[PDB]
Amino acid sequence: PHGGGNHQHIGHASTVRRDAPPGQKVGLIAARRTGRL
Amino acid sequence: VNVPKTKKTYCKNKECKKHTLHKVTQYKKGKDSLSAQGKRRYDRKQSGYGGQTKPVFHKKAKTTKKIVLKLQCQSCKHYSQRAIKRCKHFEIGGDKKG
Amino acid sequence: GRVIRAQRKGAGSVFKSHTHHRKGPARFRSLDFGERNGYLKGVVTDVIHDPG
RNA sequence: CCGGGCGGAAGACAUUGUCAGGUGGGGAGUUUGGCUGGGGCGGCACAUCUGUUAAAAGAUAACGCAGGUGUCCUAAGAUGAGCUCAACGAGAACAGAAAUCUCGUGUGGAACAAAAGGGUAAAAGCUCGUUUGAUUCUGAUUUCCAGUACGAAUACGAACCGUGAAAGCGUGGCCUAUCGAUCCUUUAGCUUCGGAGUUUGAAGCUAGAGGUGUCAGAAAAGUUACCACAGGGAUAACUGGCUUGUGGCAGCCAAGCGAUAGCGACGUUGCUUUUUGAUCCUUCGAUGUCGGCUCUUCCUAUCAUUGUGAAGCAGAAUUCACCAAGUGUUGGAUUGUUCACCCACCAAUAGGGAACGUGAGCUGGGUUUAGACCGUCGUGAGACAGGUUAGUUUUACCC
RNA sequence: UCCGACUUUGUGAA
RNA sequence: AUGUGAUUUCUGCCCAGUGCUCUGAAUGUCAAAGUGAAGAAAUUCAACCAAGCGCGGGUAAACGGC
RNA sequence: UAAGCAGAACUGGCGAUGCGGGAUGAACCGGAAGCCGGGUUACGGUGCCCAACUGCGCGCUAACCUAGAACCCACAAAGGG
RNA sequence: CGUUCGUCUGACUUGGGUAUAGGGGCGAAAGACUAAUCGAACCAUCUAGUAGCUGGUUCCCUCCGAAGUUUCCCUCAGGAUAGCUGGAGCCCAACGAGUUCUAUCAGGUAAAGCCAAUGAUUAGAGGCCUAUUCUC
RNA sequence: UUGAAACACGGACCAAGGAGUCUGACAUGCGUGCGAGUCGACGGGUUCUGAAACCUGGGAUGCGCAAGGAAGCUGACGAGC
Numbered sequence A: 001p002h003g004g005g006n007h008q009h010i011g012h013a014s015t016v017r018r019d020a021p022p023g024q025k026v027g028l029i030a031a032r033r034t035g036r037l
Numbered sequence B: 001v002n003v004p005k006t007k008k009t010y011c012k013n014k015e016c017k018k019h020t021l022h023k024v025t026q027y028k029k030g031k032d033s034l035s036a037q038g039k040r041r042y043d044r045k046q047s048g049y050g051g052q053t054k055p056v057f058h059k060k061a062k063t064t065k066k067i068v069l070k071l072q073c074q075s076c077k078h079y080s081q082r083a084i085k086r087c088k089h090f091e092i093g094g095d096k097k098g
Numbered sequence C: 001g002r003v004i005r006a007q008r009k010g011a012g013s014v015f016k017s018h019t020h021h022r023k024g025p026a027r028f029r030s031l032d033f034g035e036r037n038g039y040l041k042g043v044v045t046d047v048i049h050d051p052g
Numbered sequence D: 001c002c003g004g005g006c007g008g009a010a011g012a013c014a015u016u017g018u019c020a021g022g023u024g025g026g027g028a029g030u031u032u033g034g035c036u037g038g039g040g041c042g043g044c045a046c047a048u049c050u051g052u053u054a055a056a057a058g059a060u061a062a063c064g065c066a067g068g069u070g071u072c073c074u075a076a077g078a079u080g081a082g083c084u085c086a087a088c089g090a091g092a093a094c095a096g097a098a099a100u101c102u103c104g105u106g107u108g109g110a111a112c113a114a115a116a117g118g119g120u121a122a123a124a125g126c127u128c129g130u131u132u133g134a135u136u137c138u139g140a141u142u143u144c145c146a147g148u149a150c151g152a153a154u155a156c157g158a159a160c161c162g163u164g165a166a167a168g169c170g171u172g173g174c175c176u177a178u179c180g181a182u183c184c185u186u187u188a189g190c191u192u193c194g195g196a197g198u199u200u201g202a203a204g205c206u207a208g209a210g211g212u213g214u215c216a217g218a219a220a221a222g223u224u225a226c227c228a229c230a231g232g233g234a235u236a237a238c239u240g241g242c243u244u245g246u247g248g249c250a251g252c253c254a255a256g257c258g259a260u261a262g263c264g265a266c267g268u269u270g271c272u273u274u275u276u277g278a279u280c281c282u283u284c285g286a287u288g289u290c291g292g293c294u295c296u297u298c299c300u301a302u303c304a305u306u307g308u309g310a311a312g313c314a315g316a317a318u319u320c321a322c323c324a325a326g327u328g329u330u331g332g333a334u335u336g337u338u339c340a341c342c343c344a345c346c347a348a349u350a351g352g353g354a355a356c357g358u359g360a361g362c363u364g365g366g367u368u369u370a371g372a373c374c375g376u377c378g379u380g381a382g383a384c385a386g387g388u389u390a391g392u393u394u395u396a397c398c399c
Numbered sequence E: 001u002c003c004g005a006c007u008u009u010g011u012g013a014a
Numbered sequence F: 001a002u003g004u005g006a007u008u009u010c011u012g013c014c015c016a017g018u019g020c021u022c023u024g025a026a027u028g029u030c031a032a033a034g035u036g037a038a039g040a041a042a043u044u045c046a047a048c049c050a051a052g053c054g055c056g057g058g059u060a061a062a063c064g065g066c
Numbered sequence G: 001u002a003a004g005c006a007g008a009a010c011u012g013g014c015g016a017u018g019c020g021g022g023a024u025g026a027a028c029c030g031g032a033a034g035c036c037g038g039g040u041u042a043c044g045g046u047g048c049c050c051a052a053c054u055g056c057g058c059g060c061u062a063a064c065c066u067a068g069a070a071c072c073c074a075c076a077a078a079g080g081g
Numbered sequence H: 001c002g003u004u005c006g007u008c009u010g011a012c013u014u015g016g017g018u019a020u021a022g023g024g025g026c027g028a029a030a031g032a033c034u035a036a037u038c039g040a041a042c043c044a045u046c047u048a049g050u051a052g053c054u055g056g057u058u059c060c061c062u063c064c065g066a067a068g069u070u071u072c073c074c075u076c077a078g079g080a081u082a083g084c085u086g087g088a089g090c091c092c093a094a095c096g097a098g099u100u101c102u103a104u105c106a107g108g109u110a111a112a113g114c115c116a117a118u119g120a121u122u123a124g125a126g127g128c129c130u131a132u133u134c135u136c
Numbered sequence I: 001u002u003g004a005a006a007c008a009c010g011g012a013c014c015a016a017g018g019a020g021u022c023u024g025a026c027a028u029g030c031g032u033g034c035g036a037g038u039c040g041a042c043g044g045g046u047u048c049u050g051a052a053a054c055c056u057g058g059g060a061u062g063c064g065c066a067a068g069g070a071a072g073c074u075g076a077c078g079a080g081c
């Protein structure tokens, strides 16, 4: 899902639903928060 | 467009084939019956696998409709149907001008 | 598309764990009457390395 | 010793099976208009009206010119009666350029929902009175035209009405645009459900509405530089051909400058095809697309050199012009360049053509495949005519 | 894949 | 399961958007089954109504903006 | 601006068509056609190429610019002597 | 293939055995590799797949002989439709005609006009008006 | 193809092979039989050359002889110019 583009970039949020199908569930799975506190 | 509510017009009913007084109301499409054959045929066709089986019209172009006036004879109590030209605003028995 | 790498690990083909030089499962002795009611003495004979 | 519970944990919850609702580019299938001085972007010339092009019957094209349409109106529809509009002249306290009244003139110079063109004066305009004919039933004809449909219109017939004393007029709007099939749904006014009935439901017949604006009417988003096929020279990107606006070069006049030494405004006539456009005739079962290196010929619109004429030519130098293409026109810094711009030498460092000469002669720095960065753009895949770096140059023995 | 109904699914107390 | 890419040094502001997430309000929407009321019945009507959606909060070393 | 450009009206033509002339050429001029003999013409020509006069007659031109020389047609201007 | 070049005690080189198979594998990631085949291998079959598109389409003479235009169509390199053409006839012989003449209707193009309406437009003259005036 | 000798494609040569066919449904035309009828097509009988041929089944098999109407249902009273 992160592949492609003319620059290396995800292009959509890397946080993904808990119920996403396999193959779609990549990145940060069911994250309550992101970033460094 | 403004139309009165007590038009005198020809009634074709066999009781009085002449000019009688009519009440004027606006026609509205009746409630769709779930038992209509085309509806029963459509529901049988939609069941199962295959997705949408009939064309679903999208490209609307008209911004008006032909208003249909129901005319009720005050002797027979039978009805007549009459469509008028396309109008954006319509009312029956509004306030007269002047 | 094609099957992603995260999906291919569940088939366990080349993603099975490397266990050829492991010394066996590490776990307590099976619970029995002596342990349930008293004590049993064992002696430590080796302290060994387990790969992985 | 006795208990016919292997020992725990959870427990009618979870789990299984079947239905129902949500989510679901993880995956499947499909689509992703047309016209078009290539295509795309733009526009709409796709239904549709007026004037003109249009060549005094009709018909008539272009992405021709100037505009318009998807509405609006119970009156702005019908009819009867009465009246006359724009504007001007002269008048009357407040009151003047425009407030209200009066007389005279007034062929429409006004108004008639709208664009434009027609048309209309005891009206088709304005004011008032009564009204709903903007009604029912089908036929016929006109315009479009295949002489099919639709829309729109006209002339009758058979009713029922309105208004007028009446003849008459009225089947919407003074005329020319103002709109929509089959299937399905819904509505308005007897037939069937086939063993017979009662009786809900359903299906029919006649006539409207719900809509297709790509308007004789599929239900529909992108990208490909990883790409494929069938074909196009019906169709772009080299060359060549026509043209010469633009580019370049040359003239005529003579107001001025300093009239015609040398120049020359305002005008005006040409030539050329080393510019760029315009076109799309040739080539898409392929004519190897930039530049330079090398090599030969050709032109003259002559830069130098030969011989001359002119000067606001004392000399020296320079400028203008003529006959003249015989001989020359170079070495370098930056840049892939072409073009450019500087250094230097020189008599001088003129301009061009030959498929923008020349890749089975080379080279491959640039353009322009596939890898990969950046900036901007895009949700994305990807794009960029922006920059950057790496990227196979085949064959001659035939005439 | 989540979610509800039925089925698996029984027994007794307030 | 992802992003960045040794060390040094530092990583500002932004939770409106799109995502992700929450133990939060509860009724705004809201399926099948089940419930009730009419009807001779087919059927119709009505209330109830799961998750999700909506409402509210968190989150940028999430996508991203400045 | 123009174009061997792009688009209309009437008619003809080429496309679908040979044959004679325009040296050559889809369309221009003549003319349309079975296989032949004889006669005569169209357009166009009569110095040679090339069949047919170096025919009869009047002027104009002299090009030391390649003088000039056949509709379409294969160009030339303003201005000068 | 030659010369030149990178690495060489490690994320090193290599044999055999074994595992993973096509919308699948495997990938220190180039859409790379998967038997000279990869942006979805190869084999047989469905299958003589479809094609408005390109190419070809075989004897002679004789007679007749076109169209590139109308309308509609997701129509624009295609169809149907009318027109143009052939064949088959059949019915008959006064009827006609891409022509003139006689008569009679209709037209707003060329030209002209502005010293006529609408519009544009130069100049004076005599008292805003009047009579002229150049040019559309 | 508007236009080909084309610097537009195919073609080195020769031999053999090589492309509007068969079937179904309609239609016009023509030919043959019968004619308000016609068809013997599936079966049966028979057949000493026979997968021919010959005979036979229709008082209702198919098309015709009668429309119109959604249907319920009705159904041509006999022409002049």
Ligand SMILES: [K+]
Binding pocket: A001, A002, A003, A004, A005, A008, A009, A010, A011
């Ligand atoms: K990406």
Ligand SMILES: [K+]
Binding pocket: B045, B046, B047, B048, B049, B050, B051, B053
């Ligand atoms: K279905």
Ligand SMILES: [K+]
Binding pocket: C001, C002, C003, H023
């Ligand atoms: K897959």
Ligand SMILES: [K+]
Binding pocket: D013
């Ligand atoms: K349970």
Ligand SMILES: [K+]
Binding pocket: none
């Ligand atoms: K589902």
Ligand SMILES: [K+]
Binding pocket: D024, D025
């Ligand atoms: K999906």
Ligand SMILES: [K+]
Binding pocket: D214
């Ligand atoms: K259409």
Ligand SMILES: [K+]
Binding pocket: D244
């Ligand atoms: K020029």
Ligand SMILES: [K+]
Binding pocket: D283, D284, D286
């Ligand atoms: K080509």
Ligand SMILES: [K+]
Binding pocket: D390
């Ligand atoms: K390299």
Ligand SMILES: [K+]
Binding pocket: F003, F061
């Ligand atoms: K990150």
Ligand SMILES: [K+]
Binding pocket: F015, F016
């Ligand atoms: K935000």
Ligand SMILES: [K+]
Binding pocket: F015
């Ligand atoms: K947010």
Ligand SMILES: [K+]
Binding pocket: H007
């Ligand atoms: K190394």
Ligand SMILES: [K+]
Binding pocket: none
């Ligand atoms: K080595």
Ligand SMILES: [K+]
Binding pocket: none
């Ligand atoms: K090994």
